[PDB]
Swiss-Prot record, chains A, B:
It is found in: Cytoplasmic vesicle, Secretory vesicle, Synaptic vesicle membrane; Cytoplasm, Cytoskeleton. GO terms for molecular function: phospholipid binding. Neurons, certain endocrine cell types and spermatocytes. Residues 6-221 form the BAR domain. One of its GO terms (cellular component) is cytosol. This is Amphiphysin. The keyword Heme does not apply. GO terms for biological process: chemical synaptic transmission; endocytosis; synaptic vesicle endocytosis. The chain holds residues 19 to 239 of 695 of the full protein. The gene is AMPH. Keywords: Coiled coil, Cytoplasm, Cytoplasmic vesicle, Cytoskeleton, Membrane, Phosphoprotein, SH3 domain, Synapse. Heterodimer with BIN1. Binds SH3GLB1. Interacts with REPS1 and SGIP1. Binds AP2A2. Interacts with AP2B1. Interacts with DNM1 and SYNJ1. Residues 1-65, 126-173 form a coiled coil.
């Protein structure tokens, strides 16, 4: 350093880079909170799907139970009930195995990053301390070479250790932030495609039940 | 009566008719229990529909909230959410106003019938008692005309009062039992037709969401 003020300029640059990094961390926290909220709501949706499945089944069971042997369509009602339950079961399971699983694995990458952010902060405090200490030693009236040399080693090491954590996270945080859209797109492509298909397939069975009831009605006219 | 054994033969016929009536009452009880069970399950189904509606809405709300201004399709996502909620709202309400209301009114006819069945039983005990009493008076060693005449009036009245309740319920119970099928047919025609239509209409919106997500995905490719 010396009269080129190298370490002082280093500190200024480090501070500007750290301000940018704290902006990344704010986005990272927002991204985690958004993901966890989506997880809660997707889980809520799955539980509502299952509730629908079960309530629908009981309803068709109760119809099959009031049926008389002579009534048209008893076996068709049973089959409608069975096929509908399979549709619900598969729809729920495919949502679990796609959108939910993918979201859980996406969220699974956050705790390790949070731990390395924590380590980076601590290592920055050590690096900051070593830089200031070296600056002080280099500007003193007494010039103690053995003392300065050791402070140089300590500064070089603290810097290396900090920058290891820093350069990785400087890459990883904005990249993870960028992947946000692809993650939401794929989650909702999965939800919407499975649901579209489910609604189309179950309509066929609703129509079959209507048809059976029409014929039962006609039989008893 | 006298030596033609009129009152004794009357009692035999009354007993055979009463055995048939008790068979009607068993069916009536079964019919009420079937209806109440169907009411419970239909209510359960409606509550599951509402749960689905609400859980679906939160899910789309959370998507709209993560959206960035530059992202394709923000207004389309909002509109999908709004239109889906209207579909759910109307589907639930039409089920309330048709199948549920109709079932509630159908079940509403049972308590008055149960009360008249109760009255009939009591009036049958009085009628039974008056018939036996008249039989006893008519066969006695002492023939007391003023006594017999009064017992005749009491028998005639108790019979009239019983038969008022009896002939109505003898008509109403099998008729109500016969209406069972039409009631189940109309309940499930309503449920299945509304659901078929709902599933068809909401599939369109699921496809719209998939389309928007596809274009959002493409935009960020």
């Amino acid at each position: 350093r010396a009269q080129e003020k190298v370490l002082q300029k280093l500190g200024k640059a480090d501070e500007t880079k750290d301000e940018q990094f704290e902006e990344y961390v704010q986005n990272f926290k927002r991204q985690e909170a958004e993901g966890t909220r989506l997880q809660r709501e997707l889980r809520g949706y799955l539980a509502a799907i299952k509730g629908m499945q079960e309530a629908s089944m009981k309803l068709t069971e109760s119809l099959h139970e009031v049926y008389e042997p002579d009534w048209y369509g008893r076996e068709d009602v049973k089959m409608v009930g069975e096929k509908c339950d399979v549709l619900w079961e598969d729809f729920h399971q495919k949502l679990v195995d796609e959108s939910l699983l993918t979201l859980d694995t996406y969220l699974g990458q956050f705790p390790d990053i949070k731990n390395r952010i924590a380590k980076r902060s601590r290592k920055l405090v050590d690096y900051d301390s070593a830089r200031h200490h070296l600056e002080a030693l280099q500007s003193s009236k007494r010039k103690d070479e053995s003392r300065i040399s050791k402070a140089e080693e300590e500064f070089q090491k603290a810097q290396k250790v900090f920058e290891e954590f820093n350069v990785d996270l400087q890459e990883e945080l904005p990249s993870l932030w960028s992947r946000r859209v692809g993650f939401y797109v794929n989650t909702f492509k999965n939800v919407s495609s499975l649901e579209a298909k489910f609604h189309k397939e179950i309509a066929v069975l609703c129509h079959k039940l209507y048809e059976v009831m029409t014929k039962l009605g006609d039989q008893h006219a």
